[PDB]
Ligand binder design. Structure first.
Ligand SMILES: Nc1nc2c(ncn2[C@@H]2O[C@H](COP(=O)(O)O)[C@@H](O)[C@H]2O)c(=O)[nH]1
Ligand code: SF4
Ligand SMILES: [Cl-]
Ligand SMILES: [Fe+3]
Length: 178
């Protein structure tokens, strides 16, 4: 009855932990470029985990791992919200479900469900598709409900947690400029 929860960023982790109790977290995001930004986001997650004694596992981040992600999304390099993001989130959640099976967790989820930008129907579709493939149950919750999003905002402010202004990939950084 344990869940492995992919973590995109510390602000969305803060929103999520208002609602989840006995979870292992999995910080895996080869979509975040460049390395300096990956490390800044990772350190914010580490700060939250130390503050609240969370159990966080950190996934692979390497030139090889980034190349695998880029292959998955390359054919739609379109805007945010399109087939490119469907491929990106499926890549992240596939790796998470793989890890969940390896570590004995019967369920998996993602803090992307707490992000106000993301498309919840798209994420739930991806999660349920991956559930069918790996036999790890996808746990869906609107993590922003119950006032948790605003609750994540005030914890982020009090803790001094880095709050990014682009989704993470190079494409989203360019779309930020335009
Ligand atoms: N700082 C912060 N970023 C978030 C949060 N939730 C999702 N994000 C990500 O940060 C990106 C910031 O993009 P923008 O704020 O320019 O729209 C979003 O598109 C999303 O991918 C959050 O709660 N706080
Ligand atoms: S905008 Fe976000 S979800 Fe879409 S491809 Fe880039 S990192 Fe992935
Ligand atoms: Cl995010
Ligand atoms: Fe996030």
């Amino acid at each position: 009855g344990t869940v492995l929860i992919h973590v995109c960023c510390a602000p969305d982790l803060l929103t999520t932990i208002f609602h989840v109790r006995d979870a292992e977290f999995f910080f895996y995001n080869p979509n975040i470029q460049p390395l300096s930004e990956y490390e800044k986001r990772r350190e914010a997650v580490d700060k939250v985990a130390n503050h609240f004694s969370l159990n966080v596992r950190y996934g692979e981040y390497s030139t090889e791992e980034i190349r695998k992600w880029y292959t998955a999304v390359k054919d739609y390099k379109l805007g945010e919200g399109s087939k490119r993001c469907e491929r990106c989130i499926s890549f992240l959640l596939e790796r998470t479900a793989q890890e969940a099976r390896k570590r004995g967790h019967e369920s998996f989820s993602t803090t992307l469900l707490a992000s106000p930008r993301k498309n919840l129907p798209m994420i739930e579709n991806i999660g349920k598709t991956i559930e069918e493939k790996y036999g790890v149950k996808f746990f869906f919750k609107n993590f922003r409900k119950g006032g948790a999003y605003q609750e994540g905002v005030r914890l982020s402010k009090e803790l001094g947690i880095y709050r990014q202004n682009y989704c993470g990939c190079v494409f989203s950084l360019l779309e930020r400029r335009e």
